[PDB]
């Protein structure tokens, strides 16, 4: 009986540790840098198909602006399944959504950083305002949208400058024009 109550707390504290971890990462200027450590293992879990995708911590356009996050598939998704690294942008249900203009219509720039500050993998896009990926969130997260063929799985395989110390850095820049 008392064994149950103890697990209860241990679980609740696990959640709090998660929340604090989340806050440690959120930004409010639309610029986000995501660090993915233990890459090799995560890359494996994706190839093996046990964990196809990973969500990044949430970030914002402003203190009370849109809530967003990124989603990556270390072994590709859709048209890039198995051949590319697929990177997507996600519009999340924010606390202040009622005060914001919809649909989300800010330009987004996604990047896989070269840890030798040389050739960064970059791609950008403007939202398709009719897409359900940019409608006001009804659930926790809208359908991710972005780049299925972001970067060839070879560009970050073996000896390359994107993977260093078994970690990669993804960067997102949300244009704040008009807000």
């Amino acid at each position: 009986q008392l064994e149950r109550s103890i697990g209860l707390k241990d679980l609740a504290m696990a959640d709090l540790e998660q929340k604090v971890l989340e806050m440690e990462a959120s930004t409010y200027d639309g610029v986000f840098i995501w660090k993915i450590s233990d890459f090799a293992r995560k890359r494996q879990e994706a190839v093996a198909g046990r964990i196809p995708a990973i969500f990044s911590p949430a970030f914002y356009t402003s203190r009370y602006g849109y809530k967003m996050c990124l989603r990556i598939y270390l072994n590709g998704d859709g048209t890039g399944r198995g051949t590319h690294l697929s990177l997507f942008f996600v519009v999340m249900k924010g606390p202040n959504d009622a005060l914001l203009r919809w649909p989300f219509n800010q330009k987004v720039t996604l990047m896989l950083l070269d840890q030798n500050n040389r050739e960064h993998v970059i791609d950008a896009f403007r939202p398709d305002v009719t897409s359900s990926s940019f409608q006001r969130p009804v659930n926790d997260m809208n359908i991710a949208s972005g780049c299925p063929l972001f970067c060839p799985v070879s560009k970050m395989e073996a000896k390359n400058s994107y993977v260093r110390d078994d970690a990669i850095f993804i960067k997102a820049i949300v244009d704040l024009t008009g807000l």
Partner: peptide, 6 residues
Amino acid sequence: YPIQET
């Protein structure tokens, strides 16, 4: 143009 995840 953004492409949705599958």
